[PDB]
């Protein structure tokens, strides 16, 4: 795409980020906006969000701690 | 004379439209270092540039 202006797996990346991200007219603060929101709040948002989703999806954290499987039953199952 | 006159607005005062239109739609980069410019309340350095 850089060489172009110097589902194709996955065309949504350069496509949506191109025609979205080039159609900004005062972009230069908004780049810092998506940066400074997305770093902390997105990284902790996803990394929280999946473990939440399993953490109530079929939890049952039963096999609560190890069920005392000694000791060094280190991820035995 | 059409190479002076039908040679269009160059006579380039649409660069003034680039000066106000790019004084507003490009105020998100120069003032991005200079939101507080002459002070440090919003903590920014007094630098925007005169280019164009």
Burial class of residue B27 (count of CB atoms within 10 Å of its CB; 0-12, 13-18, 19+)? middle
- Tell which residue, A58, A59, A54, A76, has the closest CA to residue A67: A76
CB-based contacts of B31: which residues, under 8 Å, 6+ apart? B37, B44, B48
Q: How was this structure determined?
A: cryo-EM
Residues of A in contact with B32 (CB under 8 A): 28-29, 32
Helix (H) / strand (E) containing A31: helix A27-37
Q: Please report the resolution in angstroms.
A: 4.4
CA B9 to mean position of chain CA atoms: 19
Question: Is the Cβ pair B25, A26 closer than 8 Å?
Answer: yes
Q: How many CB atoms lie under 10 A from the CB of residue A15?
A: 13
Q: A62 CB near a chain B CB, below 8 Å?
A: no
Altogether, the residues listed in chain B come to a count of 52
Compute the nearest-CA separation of A11 from chain B (Å): 29
- Mutation target for A interface from B18, B27, B29: give the one with most A CBs within 10 A: B29
């Amino acid at each position: 795409d850089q060489s172009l202006n110097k589902q194709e797996n996955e065309g949504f990346n350069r496509i949506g980020f191109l025609l979205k991200t080039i159609n900004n007219i005062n972009k230069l603060p908004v780049a810092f906006n998506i940066i400074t929101e997305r770093a902390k709040e997105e990284i902790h948002n996803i990394i929280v969000k999946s473990t939440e989703s399993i953490r109530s999806k079929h939890p049952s954290l039963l096999k609560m701690a190890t069920s005392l499987k000694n000791d060094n039953h280190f991820g035995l199952p | 004379e059409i190479k002076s006159l039908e040679s269009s607005n160059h006579e380039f005062l649409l660069s003034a439209v680039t000066r106000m239109y790019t004084q507003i739609k490009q105020v998100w980069s120069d003032n991005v270092e200079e939101q507080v410019l002459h002070f440090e309340r919003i903590s920014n350095a007094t630098t925007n540039g005169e280019i164009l």
